[PDB]
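new request in #modeling-help
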Amino acid sequence: DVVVLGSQEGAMHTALTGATEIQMSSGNLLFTGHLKCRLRMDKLQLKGM
Amino acid sequence: DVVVLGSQEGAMHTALTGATEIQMSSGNLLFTGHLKCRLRMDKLQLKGM
Amino acid sequence: SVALVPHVGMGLETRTETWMSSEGAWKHAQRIETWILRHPGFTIMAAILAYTIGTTYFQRVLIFILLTAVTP
Amino acid sequence: SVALVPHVGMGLETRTETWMSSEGAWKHAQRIETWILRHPGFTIMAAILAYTIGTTYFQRVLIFILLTAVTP
């Protein structure tokens, strides 16, 4: 006999634990991650003197 | 936020492995198992003599 | 199946919490300890093994906590 | 979840085959070996541990196969 295995969807959740999720609706929402920028401040006024 | 967990049905299959299944449609089908009977044959013709 | 290989150690982990956050670990423990309660004999025999093999004491401890880790 | 409790040793069996029927065992092996292939370093360090502790050759073998078993 042959048997449809049945949805694993939840179990797949149990798998994808240990991973940051991401919401994606339109094109991307991506959150988390990190980045490193370097900042050159030269031309900054004190905002009044 | 709150999240519906998602069906485990398959994973439940993965669990119920290591178990004999049983078909049950009407009232029982039960198969497998085993039984012990003792047989007293006294009461038997050879079927023709 | 996906039941195991649950993408854990891996990498890439971010500042923000991920999924089962702060559960699946204590799940894992509670699970296996439960199964220990259910099958005490296997604990017994295993421990005995620990007292048999190696057994320079720290060794016993180690190979024993294998017993814990044997199989759910 | 049900991902792990998979009602195996238990008892009661029967004369007739049950469910995954000569698979889930070889499943279990194949997947853990796969995960070994993916993370060879951990194998290396672990083995080293085996050569460190006890080491009573048979001991090494044991605790090694343990540290193989240790991956969830």
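bot summary: The longest helix of chain A spans residues 9-16.
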